[PDB]
C-alpha cells in the first residue's frame, strides 16, 4: 500500500459530490439544520450497497441536499484535496454537477465560489494543479444542459472541459451533441462517460459526435475489437475506475477486471476513484485492489500512474 501511495498520480475521473464522506454529510446537515432521513452515520454507510448505476445515483443525488453554502462546497473540495495530499495525487481534474445544485436553488456562483476557493488553496498550499470539469446530467434534457452552459459562459475560464455523467443507458452522447458543439465553440475541451453500463456504440458517439479528449470508464470497449484497435492506435486515454466498477456490478469481481488486460494491449488506461466516499476508497485504494486481486506489479503500477500524468489536459 505505502509504495502505491507514494507514487505520483493524477486523478482525472472524480466527482466532487462523490467525495462526500458520511461523516461530512452529517456535520453539514448539522450546520445547515437539516434533519436527515438517516438515523446515524453508520446507517448511511451501510446503505452504500448498489446493484447498478441507478441505485447509486439515486443515493448520490439524495446526498447533495446538505450542500447549500459556499462554505459547504469549500469544505467538500478541501477535504478531497487533503486526501490527494495524503495519497500524493499531484494533479486533479475533477467533475462537478452544477445542475444537481442549481436545480435545488443554490446559485451557480456559490457552487463555483466554494470549489474554486478550495482549488486555489490546493494549489498554493498543497502544490496540486487542477483542471475543473463541468459535467452535464445526461438524464436531463439537452435544453437544461444548454441553460447550464449559458450560466457557465461568464465563468468559462474556470473550466478546462465539459463532461457528461449520470444514467448512461438510454441517454446516448448524441442526445447532447448540440450543447457539446457549443461548448467546444466557446473554448471548452470535452470528455464523457461512455461504456460503463453503456454499449461500445456510445463510446464511438463520444469519440466522433462529442469529440472528446478522453473516455471516462470505457471498459465495455473490450467488447469491440475494431474500437480496441482505435483506442490502442490513437492513444486516447481511458479513466478507468476499479472499485466503482465492482461496487456498481460492472464486474462481478475485481479478479474479472480487464484494466490490466487493456494496459498490456497498449490502451492508455488510468486509475481513478470516481466516487470514493461511496465506493470505499480513493485513488490509492484503487491501485491496491488491482494488485491484490489482479496481481498488478510495480511495473504496471508505475505505468498506470505515468499514464494519468500523460493524460492531463
Ligand atoms: Zn463517474
Curated annotation (Swiss-Prot):
Protein species of origin: Pseudomonas aeruginosa (strain ATCC 15692 / DSM 22644 / CIP 104116 / JCM 14847 / LMG 12228 / 1C / PRS 101 / PAO1)
Protein name from the UniProt record: Adenine deaminase
CDD domains tied to this protein: ADA
PANTHER family on file: ADENINE DEAMINASE
Positions with a binding annotation for Zn(2+): 13, 15, 193, 274
Record text on cofactor binding: Binds 1 zinc ion per subunit.
Alphabetized UniProt keyword annotations: Hydrolase, Metal-binding, Nucleotide metabolism, Zinc
Function: Catalyzes the hydrolytic deamination of adenine to hypoxanthine. Plays an important role in the purine salvage pathway and in nitrogen catabolism.
Gene3D superfamilies in the cross-refs: Metal-dependent hydrolases
Gene Ontology molecular function terms on file: adenine deaminase activity; zinc ion binding
Transmembrane segments: none
Site description Important for catalytic activity, residues in chain: 217
Cofactor(s) annotated in UniProt: Zn(2+)
GO biological-process terms attached to the record: adenine catabolic process; hypoxanthine salvage; nucleotide metabolic process
Reactions catalysed, as given in the entry: adenine + H2O + H(+) = hypoxanthine + NH4(+)
Amino acid at each position: 500500500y505505502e509504495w502505491l501511495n507514494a507514487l505520483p498520480k493524477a486523478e482525472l475521473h472524480l466527482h466532487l459530490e462523490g467525495t462526500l464522506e458520511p461523516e461530512l454529510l452529517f456535520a453539514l446537515a448539522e450546520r445547515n439544520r437539516i434533519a436527515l432521513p438517516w438515523n446515524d452515520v453508520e446507517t448511511l454507510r451501510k446503505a452504500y450497497a448498489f446493484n447498478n448505476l441507478q441505485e447509486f445515483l439515486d443515493l448520490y443525488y439524495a446526498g447533495a441536499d446538505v450542500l447549500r453554502t459556499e462554505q459547504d462546497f469549500y469544505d467538500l473540495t478541501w477535504a478531497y484535496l487533503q486526501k490527494c495530499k495524503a495519497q500524493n495525487v499531484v494533479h486533479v481534474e475533477p467533475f462537478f454537477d452544477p445542475q444537481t445544485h442549481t436545480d435545488r436553488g443554490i446559485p451557480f456562483e456559490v457552487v463555483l465560489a466554494g470549489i474554486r476557493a478550495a482549488l486555489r488553496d490546493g494549489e498554493k498550499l498543497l502544490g496540486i494543479r487542477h483542471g475543473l470539469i463541468l459535467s452535464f446530467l445526461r438524464h436531463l434534457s439537452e435544453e437544461q444542459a444548454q441553460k447550464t452552459l449559458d450560466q457557465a459562459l461568464p465563468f468559462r475560464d474556470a473550466f478546462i472541459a465539459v463532461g457528461l455523467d449520470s444514467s448512461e443507458v438510454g441517454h446516448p452522447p448524441s442526445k447532447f451533441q448540440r450543447v457539446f458543439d457549443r461548448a467546444r465553440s466557446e473554448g471548452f475541451l470535452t470528455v464523457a462517460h461512455a461504456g460503463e453500463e453503456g454499449p461500445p456504440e456510445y463510446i464511438w458517439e463520444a469519440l466522433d459526435l462529442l469529440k472528446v479528449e478522453r473516455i471516462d470508464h470505457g471498459v465495455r470497449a473490450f467488447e469491440d475489437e475494431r474500437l480496441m484497435r482505435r483506442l490502442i492506435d490513437e492513444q486516447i486515454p481511458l479513466t478507468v475506475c476499479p472499485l466503482s466498477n465492482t461496487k456498481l456490478c460492472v464486474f462481478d469481481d475485481m479478479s474479472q477486471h480487464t484494466i490490466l488486460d487493456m494496459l498490456e494491449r497498449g490502451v492508455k488506461v488510468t486509475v481513478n476513484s470516481d466516487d470514493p466516499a461511496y465506493f470505499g476508497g480513493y485513488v490509492t485504494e484503487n491501485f491496491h485492489a488491482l494488485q491484490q486481486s489482479l496481481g498488478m506489479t510495480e511495473e504496471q503500477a508505475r505505468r498506470l500512474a505515468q499514464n494519468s500524468l500523460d493524460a492531463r489536459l
